[PDB]
From a paper:
DExD/H-box RNA helicases, from virus and bacteria to eukaryotes, play important roles in processes including ribosome biogenesis, RNA processing and folding, ribonucleoprotein (RNP) remodeling, RNA nuclear export, the regulation of RNA translation and transcription, and nonsense-mediated RNA decay. DExD/H-box proteins often contain accessory regulatory domains and localization modules, but their cores consist of two RecA-like domains joined by a short flexible linker. The N-terminal domain is commonly referred to as conserved domain-1, or DEAD-domain, and the C-terminal domain as conserved domain-2, or helicase domain. Both domains contribute to the binding site for RNA substrates and both contribute to ATP hydrolysis. We used X-ray crystallography to determine the structures of the DEAD-domains of DDX2A, DDX2B, DDX5, DDX10, DDX18, DDX20, DDX47, DDX52, and DDX53, as well as the helicase domains of DDX25 and DDX41.
Its side chain stacks with the nucleotide base, stabilizing it in its position. Interestingly this residue is not conserved: While phenylalanine is most common, DDX10 has a tyrosine and DDX47 has a tryptophan in the corresponding position. In the crystal complexes with either ADP or AMP the loop closes up, resulting in a shift in Cα-atom positions by up to 3.5 Å between the ATP- and the AMP-states, or by up to 2.5 Å between the ADP- and the AMP-state. Inspection of the RNA complexes of DDX19, vasa, and eIF4AIII shows that the conserved motif that makes the most extensive contacts with the RNA-backbone phosphates is motif Ib.
Residue numbers in the entry: 11 to 230
Amino acid sequence: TEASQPIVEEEETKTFKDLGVTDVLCEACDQLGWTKPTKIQIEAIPLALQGRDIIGLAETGSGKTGAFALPILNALLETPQRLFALVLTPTRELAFQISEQFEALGSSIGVQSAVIVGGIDSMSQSLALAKKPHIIIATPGRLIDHLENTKGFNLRALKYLVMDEADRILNMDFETEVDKILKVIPRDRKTFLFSATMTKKVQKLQRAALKNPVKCAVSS
Ligand SMILES: Nc1ncnc2c1ncn2[C@@H]1O[C@H](COP(=O)(O)O)[C@@H](O)[C@H]1O
């Protein structure tokens, strides 16, 4: 069930290409100054590219965003589709930070993202959703506001779900909102869940939201 932790020689030598990342995305990494993959990237990317669900035990600073963004963008290039991936976050700040990385990696290949968070007028958000972005990065309550109230908005097309900082999502009282979202997305999708630790509450969510996941743990 557990991913192979990278050892010192592998940290020193692995490339993004070695992980299976397509050439145009290897170039985007270089352009960002991502010249070596992090350990969570080395663990999760090949498994995700093979189509495995992922549970990542990792925190900011580990490179967890690239560990899910790169496989999502790789698949998007293979099979372009709007409303392709949803990333859920506990906070609006993390949503903007994740969008910065998707835009940095994907803007030049034409990938469109939309951030859907509190503190922003709903009419700009409804327009952004009508424009059918490839990626939506949202906090759970604001996403449900749009699922309930924004005409024509739904997640039936989704191929990827990410729950980033899932321990914090649950600790911030979004259990019901997450459960509601899980009811109105497709079962046939790829899913990532990242958390700083495994707890009973996180294990309940992973058993509800992931299929045969590989556990990828790092300390840095
Ligand atoms: N392979 C990498 N090489 C250099 N920097 C990276 C790499 N992956 C992620 N980063 C940066 O690490 C920071 C923390 O990312 P994260 O741990 O996803 O919150 C962000 O500023 C990323 O741009």
